A and B are shown apart, each in its own frame.
Chain A
């Protein structure tokens, strides 16, 4: 019962190459080089799915800080004031408000400094 490998092997190599398309030089043409490229891409994706949350939190904090300093407070003091006032709006929403609506962010800053004092 002799078995030929051609069809299955070709299908596997073709699938790897198809996943590899868009890379430079031998990475998108040669199976040996392409197979390594796919695995490293997967590893980078696994690490970046975690890094993304940190990066977006840092961006939100920066925008909130800019808005707070326009309204006369630092980011840390505004966060403390909001916590004292018992406001539970998160930083993503606070940053969106800071970017798109200055009056509402000013009202929030007023509330925070009122709680501070």
Chain B
């Protein structure tokens, strides 16, 4: 049959020109104690690590 996508991963990963982008953790609820530098630097998107690129490729074949 056709390969099926892992929708949970598809909702966390998007494709770039040469790789995959992702959001960062530790920014949801507990924030008062965290410093301003951490608050600002954890914002935005980052790139998926090469070691973990293979699993993302397996879980998201068509993206």
Do A and B touch directly, given a CB cutoff of 8 Å in the complex?
no
